[PDB]
């Protein structure tokens, strides 16, 4: 299928693109395309953020209107199906380089040299405790801003990424 959405970019100068327009995003014959818009409410004075295409997503299924369902968040977001369905939108809540030490690199003084970053982490397992350090490239760091690999869960495992030389050592 083929889908044309309204495209808008607020950070269009730094990113060097058109401020507003309409784009056509070719899709996959196996999945479906959507349109999306994002804006800040802030006391009735609406400021645009980003409009455009939005690949398949289970939440935008069967929605001809772009209505933010979130319960009063900072940045409002909505999506919809069909050509140009992001032309309008409203808010209606729902009622429902560097070098480090990698613990499996003893071949070279337990070291590395990735362009991305390096991590260290562990938890209580195999009885007592463990220890893990490693380094991963820039590509594997996804998303760009906040690589998940650098995130943890409060309840057990901790995690930390870092960029400086040899920062992934001991807790």
């Amino acid at each position, epitope marked *: 299928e083929t889908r044309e959405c*309204i495209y808008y970019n607020a950070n269009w100068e730094l990113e060097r693109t058109n401020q507003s327009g309409l784009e056509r995003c070719e899709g996959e014959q196996d999945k479906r395309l959507h349109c999306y818009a994002s804006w800040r409410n802030s006391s009735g*004075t609406i400021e645009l953020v980003k409009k455009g295409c939005w690949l398949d997503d289970f939440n935008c299924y069967d929605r001809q209107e772009c209505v933010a369902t979130e319960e009063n968040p900072q940045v409002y977001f909505c999506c919809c199906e069909g*050509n140009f369905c992001n*032309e*309008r*939108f409203t808010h209606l809540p729902e009622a429902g380089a560097l070098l480090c030490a990698c613990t499996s690199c003893l071949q070279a003084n337990y070291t590395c040299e990735t362009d991305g970053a390096c991590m260290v982490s562990i938890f209580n397992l195999d009885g007592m405790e463990h220890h893990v350090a490693t380094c991963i490239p820039k590509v594997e760091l996804v998303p760009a801003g906040k690589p998940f690999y650098c995130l943890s869960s409060e309840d057990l495992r901790n995690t930390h990424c870092c960029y400086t030389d040899y920062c992934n050592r001991i807790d």
Partner: antibody
Amino acid sequence: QLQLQESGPGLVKPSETLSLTCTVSGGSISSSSYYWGWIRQPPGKGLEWIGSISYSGSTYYNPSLKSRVTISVDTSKNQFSLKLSSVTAADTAVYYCARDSLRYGMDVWGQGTTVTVSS
Amino acid sequence: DIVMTQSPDSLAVSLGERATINCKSSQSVLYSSNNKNYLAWYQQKPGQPPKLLIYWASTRESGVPDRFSGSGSGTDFTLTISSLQAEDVAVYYCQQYALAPPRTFGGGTKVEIKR
């Protein structure tokens, strides 16, 4: 729900510029549409699309009356302005402020404003 | 710029009888991407702004009764009011609003009732 209000001078001297402002209610201009539109209806004739404009500023004057029309927006005042130079008695008409859509065509309209050109 | 030509000018049919109007376009209104026609049918009663009846050639708008139906394709479209009523007396306009910039209107076809 959305309401399109419009307002103008009502009377205009011959061979002078004309202006019309279109306030909006129950819906932010940057929201609830991509295009906005000015249409007019001569006294007892049909309709004629004057122009449209996206809330980002780009305009599309009708090729019939292009180079005399000027159309703009103001998202800080939730407004929407039309201007028409060198008027003749043919320009006398009822001007409608509507919202042009790319799925439903012009769906919502205003209450119209009558503009006469007479000395 | 997709010239619009409605037909006829006047139309007089009795209460509860069928009314049909036809508008022709000089350029095709069909869109290849999504297989759709960007045409609109509007109603205007005296002193009131026009009211959109049909969009996408044959899709009806919320709150519009069933007696109104749109049909056609390419450069020929039709609008039928089955069983005319006295409230449906008005002028009717055929418009095109495809992505191309110049959006043009028809000539205006009035509907009259026989009594």
